[PDB]
Short mmCIF file of C-alpha atoms in Angstrom, two decimals:
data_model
loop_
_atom_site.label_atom_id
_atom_site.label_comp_id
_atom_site.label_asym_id
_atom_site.label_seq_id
_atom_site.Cartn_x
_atom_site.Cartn_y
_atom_site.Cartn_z
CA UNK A 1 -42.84 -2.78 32.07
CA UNK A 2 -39.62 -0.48 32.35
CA UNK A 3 -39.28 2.28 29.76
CA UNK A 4 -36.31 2.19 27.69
CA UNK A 5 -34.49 4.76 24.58
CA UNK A 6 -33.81 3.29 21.46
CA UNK A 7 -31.97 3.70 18.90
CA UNK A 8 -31.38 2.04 15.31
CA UNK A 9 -28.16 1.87 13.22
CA UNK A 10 -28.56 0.94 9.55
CA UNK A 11 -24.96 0.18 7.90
CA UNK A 12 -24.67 2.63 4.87
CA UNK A 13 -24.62 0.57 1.08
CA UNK A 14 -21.28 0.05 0.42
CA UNK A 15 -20.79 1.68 -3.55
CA UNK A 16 -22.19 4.38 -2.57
CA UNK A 17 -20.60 5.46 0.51
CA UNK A 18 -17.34 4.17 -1.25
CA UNK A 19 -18.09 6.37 -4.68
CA UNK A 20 -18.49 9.38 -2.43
CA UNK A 21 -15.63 9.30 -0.30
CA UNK A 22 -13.04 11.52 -1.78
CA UNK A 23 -9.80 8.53 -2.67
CA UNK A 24 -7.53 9.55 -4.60
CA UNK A 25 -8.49 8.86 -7.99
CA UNK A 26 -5.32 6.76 -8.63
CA UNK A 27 -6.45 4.05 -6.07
CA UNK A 28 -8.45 1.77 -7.72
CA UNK A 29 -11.30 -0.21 -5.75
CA UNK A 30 -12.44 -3.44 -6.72
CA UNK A 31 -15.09 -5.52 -4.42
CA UNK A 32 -15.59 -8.50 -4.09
CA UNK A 33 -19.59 -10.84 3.81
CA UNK A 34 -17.34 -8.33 1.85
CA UNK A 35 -13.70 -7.84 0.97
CA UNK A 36 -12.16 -4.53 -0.95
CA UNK A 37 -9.04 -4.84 -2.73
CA UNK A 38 -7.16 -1.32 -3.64
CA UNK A 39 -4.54 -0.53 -5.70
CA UNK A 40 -1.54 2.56 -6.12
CA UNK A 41 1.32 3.12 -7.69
CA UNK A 42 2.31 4.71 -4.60
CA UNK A 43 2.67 2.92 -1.42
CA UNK A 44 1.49 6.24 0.70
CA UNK A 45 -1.26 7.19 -1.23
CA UNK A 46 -2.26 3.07 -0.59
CA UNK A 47 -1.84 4.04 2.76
CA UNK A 48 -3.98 6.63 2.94
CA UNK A 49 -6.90 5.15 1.16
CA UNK A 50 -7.20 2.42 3.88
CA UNK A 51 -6.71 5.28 6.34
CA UNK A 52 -10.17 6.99 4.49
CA UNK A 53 -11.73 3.83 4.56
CA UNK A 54 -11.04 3.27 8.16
CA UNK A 55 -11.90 6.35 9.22
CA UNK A 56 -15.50 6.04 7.29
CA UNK A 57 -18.74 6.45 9.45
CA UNK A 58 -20.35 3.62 7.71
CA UNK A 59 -23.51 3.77 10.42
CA UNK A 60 -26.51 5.77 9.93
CA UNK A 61 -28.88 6.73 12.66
CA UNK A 62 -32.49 6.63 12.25
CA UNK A 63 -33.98 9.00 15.07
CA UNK A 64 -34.70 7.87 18.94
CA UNK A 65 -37.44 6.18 20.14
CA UNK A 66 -38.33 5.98 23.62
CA UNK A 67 -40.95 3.78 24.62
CA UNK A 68 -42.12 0.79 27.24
CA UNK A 69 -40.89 -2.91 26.44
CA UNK A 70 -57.48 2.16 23.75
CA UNK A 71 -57.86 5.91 21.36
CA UNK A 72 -53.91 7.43 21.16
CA UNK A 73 -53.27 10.99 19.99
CA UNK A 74 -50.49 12.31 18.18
CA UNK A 75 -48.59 16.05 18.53
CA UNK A 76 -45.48 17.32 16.93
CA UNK A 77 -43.80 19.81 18.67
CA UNK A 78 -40.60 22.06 16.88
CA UNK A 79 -38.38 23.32 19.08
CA UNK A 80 -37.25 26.41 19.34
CA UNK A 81 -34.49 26.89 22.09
CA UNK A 82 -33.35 24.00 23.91
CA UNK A 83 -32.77 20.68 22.61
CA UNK A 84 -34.61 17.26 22.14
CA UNK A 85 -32.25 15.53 24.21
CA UNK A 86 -32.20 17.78 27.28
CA UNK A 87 -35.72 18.42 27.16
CA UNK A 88 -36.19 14.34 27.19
CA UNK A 89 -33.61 13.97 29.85
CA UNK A 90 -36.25 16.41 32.09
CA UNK A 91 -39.14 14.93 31.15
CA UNK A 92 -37.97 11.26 31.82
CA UNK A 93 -36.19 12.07 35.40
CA UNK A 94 -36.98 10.53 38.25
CA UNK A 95 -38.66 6.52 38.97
CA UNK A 96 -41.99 7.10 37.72
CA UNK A 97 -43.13 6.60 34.14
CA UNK A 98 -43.83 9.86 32.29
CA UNK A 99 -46.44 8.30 29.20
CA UNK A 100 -48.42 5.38 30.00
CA UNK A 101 -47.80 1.73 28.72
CA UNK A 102 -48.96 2.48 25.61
CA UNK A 103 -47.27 5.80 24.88
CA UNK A 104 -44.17 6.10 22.91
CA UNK A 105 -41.76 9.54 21.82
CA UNK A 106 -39.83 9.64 18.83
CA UNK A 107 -36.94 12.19 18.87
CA UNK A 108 -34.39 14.01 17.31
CA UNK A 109 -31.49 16.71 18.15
CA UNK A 110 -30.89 17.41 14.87
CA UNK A 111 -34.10 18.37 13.90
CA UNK A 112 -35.18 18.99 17.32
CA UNK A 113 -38.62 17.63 16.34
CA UNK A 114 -40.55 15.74 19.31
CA UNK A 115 -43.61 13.64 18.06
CA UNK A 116 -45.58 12.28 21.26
CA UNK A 117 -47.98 9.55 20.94
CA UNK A 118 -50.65 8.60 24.21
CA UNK A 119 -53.69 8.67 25.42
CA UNK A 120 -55.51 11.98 25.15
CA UNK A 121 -54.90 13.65 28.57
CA UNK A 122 -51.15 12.36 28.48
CA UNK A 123 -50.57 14.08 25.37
CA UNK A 124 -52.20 17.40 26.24
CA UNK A 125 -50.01 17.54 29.55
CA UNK A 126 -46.71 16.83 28.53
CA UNK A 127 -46.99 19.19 24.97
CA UNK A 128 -47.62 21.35 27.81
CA UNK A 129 -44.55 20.25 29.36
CA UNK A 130 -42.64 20.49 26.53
CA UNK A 131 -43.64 23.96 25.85
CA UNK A 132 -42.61 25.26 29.12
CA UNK A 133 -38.93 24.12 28.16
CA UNK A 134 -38.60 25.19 25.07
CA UNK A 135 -35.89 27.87 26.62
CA UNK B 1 2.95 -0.16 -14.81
CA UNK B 2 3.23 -2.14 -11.37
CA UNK B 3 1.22 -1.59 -8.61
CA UNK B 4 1.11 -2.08 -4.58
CA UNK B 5 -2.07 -4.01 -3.54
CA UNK B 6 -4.14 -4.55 0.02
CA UNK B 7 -6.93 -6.65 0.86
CA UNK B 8 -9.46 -4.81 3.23
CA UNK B 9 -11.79 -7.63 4.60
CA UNK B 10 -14.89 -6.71 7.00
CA UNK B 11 -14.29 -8.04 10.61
CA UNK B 12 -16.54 -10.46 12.62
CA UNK B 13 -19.18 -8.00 14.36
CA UNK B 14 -21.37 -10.35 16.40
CA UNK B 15 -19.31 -11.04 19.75
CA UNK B 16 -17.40 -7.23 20.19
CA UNK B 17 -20.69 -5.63 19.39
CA UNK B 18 -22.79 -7.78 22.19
CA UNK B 19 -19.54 -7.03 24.30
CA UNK B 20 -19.93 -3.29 24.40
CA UNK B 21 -23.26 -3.33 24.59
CA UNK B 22 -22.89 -4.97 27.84
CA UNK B 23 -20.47 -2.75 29.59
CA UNK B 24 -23.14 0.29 28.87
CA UNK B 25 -26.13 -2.23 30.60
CA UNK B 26 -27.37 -1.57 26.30
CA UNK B 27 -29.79 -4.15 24.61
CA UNK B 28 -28.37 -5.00 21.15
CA UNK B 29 -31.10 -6.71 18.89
CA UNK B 30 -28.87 -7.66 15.32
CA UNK B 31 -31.18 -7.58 12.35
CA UNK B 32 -29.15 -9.59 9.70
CA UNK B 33 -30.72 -9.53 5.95
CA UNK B 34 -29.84 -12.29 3.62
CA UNK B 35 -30.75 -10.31 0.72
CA UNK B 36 -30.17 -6.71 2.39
CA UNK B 37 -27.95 -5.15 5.25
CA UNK B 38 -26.88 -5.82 9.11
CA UNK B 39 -29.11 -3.72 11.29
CA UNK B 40 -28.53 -2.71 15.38
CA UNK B 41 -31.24 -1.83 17.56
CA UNK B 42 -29.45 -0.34 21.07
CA UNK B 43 -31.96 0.27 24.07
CA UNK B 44 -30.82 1.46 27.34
CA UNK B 45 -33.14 3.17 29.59
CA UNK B 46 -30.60 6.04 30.41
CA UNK B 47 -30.28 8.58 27.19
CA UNK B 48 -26.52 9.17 28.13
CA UNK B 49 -25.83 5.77 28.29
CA UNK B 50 -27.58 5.02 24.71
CA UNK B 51 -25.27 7.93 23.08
CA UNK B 52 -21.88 6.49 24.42
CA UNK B 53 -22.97 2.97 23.16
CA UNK B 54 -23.82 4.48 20.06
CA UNK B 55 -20.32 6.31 20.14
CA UNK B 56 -18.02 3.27 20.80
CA UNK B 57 -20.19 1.42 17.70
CA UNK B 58 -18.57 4.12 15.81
CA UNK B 59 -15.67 4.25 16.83
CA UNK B 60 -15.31 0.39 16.10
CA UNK B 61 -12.32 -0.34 13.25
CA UNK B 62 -14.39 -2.35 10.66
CA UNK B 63 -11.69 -3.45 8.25
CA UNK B 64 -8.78 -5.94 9.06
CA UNK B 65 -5.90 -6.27 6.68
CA UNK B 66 -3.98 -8.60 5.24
CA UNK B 67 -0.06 -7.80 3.58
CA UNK B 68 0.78 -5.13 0.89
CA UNK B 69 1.29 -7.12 -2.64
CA UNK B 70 3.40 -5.32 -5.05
CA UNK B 71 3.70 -6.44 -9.16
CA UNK B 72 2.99 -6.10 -12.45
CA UNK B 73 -0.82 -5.62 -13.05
CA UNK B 74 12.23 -20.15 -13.61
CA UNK B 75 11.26 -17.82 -11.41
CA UNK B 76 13.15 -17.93 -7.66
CA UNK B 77 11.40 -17.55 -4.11
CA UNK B 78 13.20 -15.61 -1.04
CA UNK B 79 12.10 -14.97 2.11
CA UNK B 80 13.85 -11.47 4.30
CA UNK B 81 13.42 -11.09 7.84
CA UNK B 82 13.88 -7.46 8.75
CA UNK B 83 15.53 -6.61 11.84
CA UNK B 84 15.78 -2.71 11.75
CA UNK B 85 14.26 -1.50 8.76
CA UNK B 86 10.14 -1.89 8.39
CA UNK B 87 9.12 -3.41 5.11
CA UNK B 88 7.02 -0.39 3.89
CA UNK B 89 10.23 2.02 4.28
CA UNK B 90 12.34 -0.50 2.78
CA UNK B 91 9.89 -1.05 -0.04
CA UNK B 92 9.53 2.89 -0.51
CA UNK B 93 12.68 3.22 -1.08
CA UNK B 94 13.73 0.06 -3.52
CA UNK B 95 10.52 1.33 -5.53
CA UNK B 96 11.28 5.00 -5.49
CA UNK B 97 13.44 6.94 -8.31
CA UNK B 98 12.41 5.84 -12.01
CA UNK B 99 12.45 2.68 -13.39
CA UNK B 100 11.00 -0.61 -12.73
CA UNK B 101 12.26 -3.00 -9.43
CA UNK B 102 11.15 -5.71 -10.66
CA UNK B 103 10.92 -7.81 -14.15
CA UNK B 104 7.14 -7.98 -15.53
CA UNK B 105 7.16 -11.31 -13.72
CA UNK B 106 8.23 -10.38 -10.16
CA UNK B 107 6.20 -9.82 -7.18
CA UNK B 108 6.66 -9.04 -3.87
CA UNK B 109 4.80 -9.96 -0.71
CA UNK B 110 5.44 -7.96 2.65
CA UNK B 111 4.20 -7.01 5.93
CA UNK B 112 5.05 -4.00 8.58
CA UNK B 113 3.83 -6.92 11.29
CA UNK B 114 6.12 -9.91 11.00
CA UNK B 115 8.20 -7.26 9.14
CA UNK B 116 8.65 -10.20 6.44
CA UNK B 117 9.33 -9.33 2.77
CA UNK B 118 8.54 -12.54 0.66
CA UNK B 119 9.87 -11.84 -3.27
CA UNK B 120 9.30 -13.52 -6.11
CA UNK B 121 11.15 -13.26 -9.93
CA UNK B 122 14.03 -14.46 -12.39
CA UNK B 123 16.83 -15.32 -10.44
CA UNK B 124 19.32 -13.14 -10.72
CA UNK B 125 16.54 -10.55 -9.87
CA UNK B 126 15.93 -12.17 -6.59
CA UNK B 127 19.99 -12.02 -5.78
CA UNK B 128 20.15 -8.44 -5.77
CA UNK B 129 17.36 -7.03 -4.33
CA UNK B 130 17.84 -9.58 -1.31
CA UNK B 131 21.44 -7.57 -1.59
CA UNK B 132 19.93 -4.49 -1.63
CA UNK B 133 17.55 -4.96 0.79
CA UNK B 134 20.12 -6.95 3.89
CA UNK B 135 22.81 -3.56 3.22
CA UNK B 136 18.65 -1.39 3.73
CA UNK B 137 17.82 -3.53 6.73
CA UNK B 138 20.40 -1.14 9.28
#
């Protein structure tokens, strides 16, 4: 009964992410929960490897939901000018509930797609709403 | 052709992650799959809140390390405590200009931590690179 954001982080697969990172080819990489053993000639270029493997963003983000913890509508709005994130921050100020128990958004700043899903009148309303920030 | 060596192993995630989560007032629901991959679900109901969470889960180092090995990819033991050089440097230069350091059958062990260089090969091996390394170690 208290509406929350979510968000989902799926760890990248490992030989991939690992192929695509840009070692130097004279490390070699040999795996084996996980362990990676890696190999140079030279003890700086070793170095360095870990450092790329360190530094590796091995999370992906799937999108955020924001939702609460009998016909529903769906609309997709693109936006044009101002972003997901600030539009959802003005939508969702303030104590009382913007969508009703049932109603969920699904968001995204780097698409800046917003795909509402409520009851009929809810969804007319806040497309509405939407549309009125897109600026 | 010999080769230095490190052992990346993934760290425990559970407790830090639930720990961070926390401090932001976040919900962390771990999805672990057997057969698949380890999954977070973060909820806070502040958007700002949910980003820096997000953020600091990022910004987490995932990979602990163990020490460098270095060799060959009666034999003597010696263990050197540094007390002014650090083991990489020293190991940089003992390995740098041509040639091998060590015989086929030598390896050495060391750590920039404990600063501890652990070497093993024939003996007479062993007696000069602890040499060279003690007149390094200044």
């Amino acid at each position: 009964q208290n509406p929350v954001f979510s968000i989902r982080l799926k760890q990248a697969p490992l030989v991939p992410t690992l192929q695509q990172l840009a070692l130097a080819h004279n490390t070699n990489l040999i795996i084996d929960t996980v362990s990676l053993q890696l190999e140079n000639v030279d003890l700086d270029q070793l170095f360095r490897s870990v450092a790329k493997i360190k530094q590796l963003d091995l999370w992906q983000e799937n999108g955020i939901y924001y939702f609460t913890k009998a016909q529903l509508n769906t609309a997709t709005i693109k936006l044009h000018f101002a972003k997901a994130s600030e539009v959802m921050k003005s939508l969702t100020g303030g104590s009382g509930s913007l969508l009703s128990p049932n109603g969920s958004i699904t968001f995204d700043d780097r698409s800046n797609l917003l795909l509402i899903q409520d009851e009929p009148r809810s969804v007319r309303n806040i497309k509405k709403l939407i549309k009125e920030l897109d600026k």
